[PDB]
C-alpha cells in the first residue's frame, strides 16, 4: 500500500513548494492522479484478500472506502478554496497540509493489517480534523465542537486500546489475518461483557450511535466545508469499518449484546429523521440525517448477516457521496447568503436552475431512489433486518416515510416557493461549484451500473 | 383587525365586508344568475331594513348575530377567483417572476443581445440612485418623532423628486411574465 | 370616503412611473441581436438503426447465453401439424352434439 | 388566447357595466362621476359596483382597495395597475 502512501506524502512538498497562485491547482491535479491510481486496489479475489505485506492488506471492504477517501481530497480542495481565498498563504498551506495528513492517516487506517496500528491511525485522524474544525471553522462554537469531537472519541477509544492490548496478550497477535483463524468463541461472562463494550463503544461513538451522537450536530456544523465533507463521508465510516473488523472476535456474545444498541438505532433513526423535520439549520439537518443513515449501518453490522454487511458497506459508500454533496450544496448557499438558516433563502430554482437540478438529484439519492446504491444499501439492510425479526419493517418503513419527508422539504424550502425579496447577492452558479456537484453525483450514478465493487468482502 | 393604513376596521367597514362575503357565499349557494339575482335583492332588502339604526350597541349586536347567520349559512366550498388566495391559479406564476437585479448578473455576451434595453435600464438605475438621497431626506423631514405612525408613505412634494420608496413598487414583475 | 389627496397623488406618481417602466420593457425591432450562426430520416435514425443495434445485440450476445430470451412454447391444438416433426396431432373425439 | 387590456378598453367596459345599472342614469355618468357625491349612491351600491367589476374582469378586488375606488376612473386605474396595461 506504499504506492499510495508515498504519493500522499509527496503531496506535502508539492503544496509547500508551489507558487502562491499554484497551490490549489497542483494539489487538485495530483490528488486526482492519486485517485485515478486508487483503482488498482480492485484486484480482489472471491476467496483471498489482496494481502500486500505484513503491515498492509486490502479486502473488498477497505477498497471502496480507500477509493472514496482518495477521491474525496480533490473535491475538498475544490470546495475549500473559495472561502480561504483571502486567507494567509502559509495558513492556506497549513490547511492543505492538514487535509493531506488526514488522507495519509485514513488510507493506512483502512489497510492496517494489525489492529493496534489500526487504532493508532484511527485516533491519529482526530488531530487534523480537530485542527481544521477549531481553526478554520466560522463561528464561536467551533471550539466547543472540537472539545466534544475529541472527548466523546477518546472516552470511547481508550477502553478500545485496553481491550486490543488484552487481545494481544491473550491471542498472541492482533493481525486480522491471524485472527481470522485463531478466533476463539467469546462465552457469556461479565468480563466478556465489558470486553464487548470496550471493543465496540469507540466505533459506536464514531458511527455515531444514537444517544452518543451529540458531538456530531456541532462538529459537522461548526466545521468548514472540507471538514464537513471528510467528517460525513469518511470519518463516520471508520466506526463501521472497525466494527466489521472487530465483531469477528466478539462471537457468540454479540448475539445477545447487540439487543440494546439495535434498539438505540432502530428507534434512533426514527428520532433523528423526525428531528430533520424541524431543523431550521440546513447544515444541522444534513448532520442529523447522517446520524439517521448511519443508524441503519449500526443495525446491519450488529445483526451480522451477509445481506446486512453488503447493504451496510453499500450504504456507507452511498452515504459518503450523498452527504458530501449535500454539505457542498449547503455551502454553495452559505457562500451567498452568509447564514445557515434554511428559511432565509427560498425560491432558488427561479434564480439558480442547474443548481436546483443538483439539489433535486442529491435529494433523490438522499431518499434512496432506485436503482441508486443508496437504495441498494437501504434495501439490503431492510431485507436482512426483516429476516432478523419481521416486526422491524415497521420501524424500517416508517423511517422511509420520514426520510422522504425531510429530503423533499429540504428541496421545497430552499429551492421552491417564492424567492426572498431582500436577498439580492444571489450570484449565478460558478463553474467550480457545478464541477463539485457533478464530481459528487456522477460517480454516485455510475456506481449503479456496476455496484458489485461496493458490496464488501462477501459479495 | 389587520390593515396597513388603519389600525382597525370601523363598524361601517365590518358591515360592508360582511355584505360582500354574504353575497359571494350566496352566489356560491345560488349558482344560476336569475336565482342569485332574486335572492341577492332579497339580501339587499335585509340589509336595507336595519340601515338607519342609531343605537351603536344595537347595530353592533345586529352585526354580530348577522355574522352568526352568515357562519351558519356559508358554503363549504365557496367560489374563489382563480388568482384570488385559495384559487386554482393563485400564485401560479410566482416561479416566473424573476426580479430585476438578476439582470445585473448577466454576462456581457448575453447583455449585448439587447443593447437598447440595457442602455435604457442604465438611465432607470441612474434615476433611482440620484433620487434615493432626496427621498431619504424627504422621509426623515416628514416622519413624526417616535417613528412613523401608519405604513402610508408621502408622495413626491417637489418638482423633479420621485415618491419615496418607489423602486420595488414600480420595478415589480408583471403578473404574466 | 376614498383616498386622501396624498394617497391619490402618490398613486398617480407611482402609476406614471410604472407605466413608463412597463413601456420601457418593450423590444427594439433589431432586438434580440443574435450572433451570426432527408425526408424520412426519423424513420432511419430513431427506428431502423435501433432495430439494427437491438437485433445484433439480441442475436449475437443475448440468445448466445442460456435462458436469457425464454419464449413460452407455442399452443398446440388437436388437428395441428408440427413443423419440426411432421407429426399430425390427432383431432378430438366426436362431440355429443347439443344443438 | 388572452387578449391584452388597454386603458380605453377597460374604460369602455367599466362605463358599460355602469350604464347597465338601474340606479345610475347613463347620461349623467362620466369618468369622474363620484358615486356618493355626484351620483348619490349608497355604500352598499358601491360594494355592488365593485362586485360587478369583479364579475366583469374576473379578479377579486380586496376590500381595503374596494372601499376607496369612488369614481370610475379610480376603478380603471386600479384594474390597469393590477393588470399592467400599456406595456
Amino acid at each position: 500500500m506504499l504506492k499510495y502512501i508515498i504519493p500522499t506524502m509527496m503531496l506535502m512538498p508539492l503544496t509547500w513548494l508551489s507558487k502562491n497562485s499554484m497551490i490549489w491547482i497542483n494539489t487538485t491535479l495530483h490528488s486526482l492522479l492519486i485517485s485515478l491510481t486508487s483503482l488498482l486496489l480492485l484486484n480482489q479475489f472471491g476467496d483471498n484478500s489482496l494481502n500486500f505485506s505484513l503491515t498492509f492488506f486490502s479486502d473488498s471492504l477497505s477498497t471502496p472506502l480507500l477509493i472514496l477517501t482518495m477521491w474525496l481530497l480533490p473535491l475538498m480542495l475544490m470546495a475549500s478554496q473559495h472561502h480561504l481565498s483571502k486567507e494567509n498563504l502559509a495558513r492556506k498551506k497549513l490547511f492543505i497540509s492538514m487535509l493531506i495528513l488526514l488522507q495519509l492517516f485514513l488510507i493506512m487506517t483502512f489497510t492496517a493489517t494489525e489492529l493496534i496500528f489500526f487504532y493508532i491511525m484511527f485516533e491519529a485522524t482526530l488531530v487534523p480534523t480537530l485542527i481544521i474544525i477549531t481553526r478554520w471553522g466560522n463561528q464561536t462554537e467551533r471550539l466547543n465542537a472540537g472539545l466534544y469531537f475529541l472527548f466523546y472519541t477518546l472516552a470511547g477509544s481508550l477502553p478500545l486500546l485496553v481491550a486490543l492490548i488484552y487481545i494481544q496478550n491473550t491471542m498472541g497477535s492482533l493481525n486480522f489475518l491471524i485472527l481470522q483463524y485463531w478466533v476463539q468463541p467469546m462465552p457469556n461472562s461479565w468480563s466478556n461483557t465489558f470486553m464487548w463494550l470496550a471493543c465496540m463503544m469507540a466505533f459506536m461513538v464514531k458511527m455515531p450511535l444514537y444517544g452518543l451522537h451529540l458531538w456530531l450536530p456541532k462538529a459537522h456544523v461548526e466545521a468548514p466545508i472540507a471538514g464537513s465533507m471528510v467528517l460525513a463521508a469518511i470519518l463516520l465510516k471508520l466506526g463501521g469499518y472497525g466494527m466489521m473488523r472487530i465483531t469477528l472476535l466478539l462471537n457468540p456474545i454479540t448475539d445477545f449484546m447487540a439487543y440494546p444498541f439495535i434498539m438505540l438505532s432502530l428507534w434512533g433513526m426514527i428520532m433523528t429523521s423526525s428531528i430533520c423535520l424541524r431543523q431550521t439549520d440546513l447544515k444541522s439537518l444534513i448532520a442529523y440525517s447522517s446520524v439517521s443513515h448511519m443508524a441503519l449501518v449500526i443495525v446491519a453490522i450488529l445483526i451480522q448477516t451477509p445481506w446486512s454487511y453488503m447493504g451496510a458497506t453499500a450504504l456507507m459508500i452511498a452515504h459518503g457521496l450523498t452527504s458530501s454533496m449535500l454539505f457542498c450544496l449547503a455551502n454553495s448557499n452559505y457562500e451567498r447568503v452568509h447564514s445557515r438558516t434554511m428559511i432565509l433563502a427560498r425560491g432558488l430554482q427561479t434564480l439558480l436552475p442547474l443548481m436546483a437540478a443538483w439539489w433535486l438529484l442529491a435529494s433523490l439519492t438522499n431518499l434512496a431512489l432506485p436503482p441508486s446504491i443508496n437504495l441498494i444499501g437501504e434495501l439490503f439492510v431492510v431485507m436482512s433486518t426483516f429476516s432478523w425479526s419481521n416486526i422491524t419493517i415497521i420501524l424500517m418503513g416508517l423511517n422511509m416515510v420520514i426520510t422522504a419527508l425531510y429530503s423533499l422539504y429540504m428541496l421545497i424550502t430552499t429551492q421552491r416557493g417564492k424567492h426572498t425579496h431582500h436577498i439580492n447577492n444571489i450570484l449565478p452558479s460558478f463553474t467550480r461549484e457545478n464541477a463539485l456537484m457533478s464530481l459528487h453525483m456522477l460517480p454516485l450514478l455510475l456506481l449503479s451500473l456496476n455496484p458489485k465493487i461496493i458490496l464488501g468482502p462477501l459479495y | 383587525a389587520f390593515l396597513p393604513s388603519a389600525a382597525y376596521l370601523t363598524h361601517q367597514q365590518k358591515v360592508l365586508q360582511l355584505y360582500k362575503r354574504a353575497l359571494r357565499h350566496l352566489e356560491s349557494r345560488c349558482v344560476h344568475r336569475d336565482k342569485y339575482r332574486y335572492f341577492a335583492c332579497l339580501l339587499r332588502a335585509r340589509f336595507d331594513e336595519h340601515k338607519n339604526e342609531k343605537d351603536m350597541v344595537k347595530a353592533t349586536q345586529l352585526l354580530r348575530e348577522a355574522e352568526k347567520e352568515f357562519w351558519h349559512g356559508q358554503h363549504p366550498q365557496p367560489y374563489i377567483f382563480p388568482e384570488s388566495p385559495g384559487g386554482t391559479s393563485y400564485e401560479r406564476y410566482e416561479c416566473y417572476k424573476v426580479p430585476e437585479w438578476c439582470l445585473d448578473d448577466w454576462h456581457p455576451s448575453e447583455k449585448a443581445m439587447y443593447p437598447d434595453y440595457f442602455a435604457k435600464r442604465e438611465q432607470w438605475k441612474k434615476l433611482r440612485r440620484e433620487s434615493w438621497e432626496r427621498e431619504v431626506k424627504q422621509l426623515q423631514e416628514e416622519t413624526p418623532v417616535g417613528g412613523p405612525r401608519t405604513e402610508a408613505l408621502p408622495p413626491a412634494r417637489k418638482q423633479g423628486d420621485l415618491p419615496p420608496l418607489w423602486w420595488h413598487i414600480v420595478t415589480r414583475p408583471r403578473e404574466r411574465p | 370616503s376614498g383616498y386622501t389627496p396624498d394617497e391619490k397623488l402618490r398613486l398617480q406618481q407611482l402609476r406614471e412611473l410604472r407605466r413608463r417602466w412597463l413601456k420601457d420593457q418593450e423590444l427594439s425591432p433589431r432586438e434580440p441581436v443574435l450572433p451570426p450562426r432527408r425526408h424520412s430520416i426519423f424513420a432511419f435514425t430513431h427506428v431502423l438503426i435501433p432495430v439494427w443495434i437491438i437485433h445484433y445485440y439480441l442475436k449475437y450476445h443475448v440468445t448466445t447465453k442460456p435462458y436469457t430470451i425464454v419464449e413460452k412454447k407455442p399452443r398446440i391444438f388437436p388437428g395441428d401439424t408440427i413443423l419440426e416433426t411432421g407429426e399430425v396431432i390427432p383431432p378430438m373425439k366426436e362431440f355429443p352434439d347439443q344443438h | 388566447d388572452a387578449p391584452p387590456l388597454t386603458l380605453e378598453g377597460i374604460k369602455d367596459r367599466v362605463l358599460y357595466v355602469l350604464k347597465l345599472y338601474d340606479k345610475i342614469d347613463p347620461e349623467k355618468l362620466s369618468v369622474n362621476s363620484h358615486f356618493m357625491k355626484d351620483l348619490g349612491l349608497d355604500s352598499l351600491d358601491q360594494v355592488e359596483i365593485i362586485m360587478a367589476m369583479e364579475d366583469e374582469f374576473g379578479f377579486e378586488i380586496p376590500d381595503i382597495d374596494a372601499e376607496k375606488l369612488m369614481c370610475p376612473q379610480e376603478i380603471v386605474d386600479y384594474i390597469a395597475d393590477k393588470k399592467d396595461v400599456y406595456e
Binding site: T350 | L103, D105, H107, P173 | - | -
Partner: peptide, 13 residues
C-alpha cells in the same frame, strides 16, 4: 409587435 422583455436569470454560466 408588442414583444415584452422576459426577465430571467443568467443562463450563460
Amino acid at each position: 409587435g408588442k414583444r415584452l422583455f422576459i426577465i430571467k436569470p443568467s443562463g450563460f454560466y
